Design a protein around this ligand. Structure first.
Ligand SMILES: *[C@@H]1O[C@H](CO)[C@@H](O)[C@H](O)[C@H]1NC(C)=O
Lengths: 51, 50
């Protein structure tokens, strides 16, 4: 990687439900919900390289 | 580099920093006296540079 940035769920300026999504995303990272979704969409075809 | 790579190459302790050299290609910067203690107790490390 060259840079290191991140995507994010956008909220309006000074919103209370920014904090509840902040708690929600970190819950799904520990139980592995996002990694089961990242392997579901960015994969989908096992390639050949194996050499 | 270190301003752009915070929480990636910026470890918070010496014991986790020597271990990070022991895992990956890591070039940890620290004081010279402790390097002279670790290198004499670990034969998989060295002090390169002055
Ligand atoms: C490097 O140092 C020790 C002692 O020389 C060696 O036995 C071992 O292979 C290495 N230690 C690791 C990989 O933790």
């Amino acid at each position: 990687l060259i840079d290191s940035k991140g995507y994010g769920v956008g909220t309006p300026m000074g919103s209370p439900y920014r904090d509840k999504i902040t708690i929600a995303i970190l819950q799904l990272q520990e139980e592995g919900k996002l990694h089961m979704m990242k392997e579901k969409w960015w994969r989908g075809n096992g390639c050949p390289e194996e050499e | 580099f270190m301003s752009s790579r915070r929480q990636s190459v910026l470890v918070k302790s010496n014991e986790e920093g020597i271990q990070r050299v022991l895992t990956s290609d890591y070039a940890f910067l620290m004081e010279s006296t402790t390097i002279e203690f670790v290198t004499q107790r670990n034969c998989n490390l060295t002090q390169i540079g002055g």
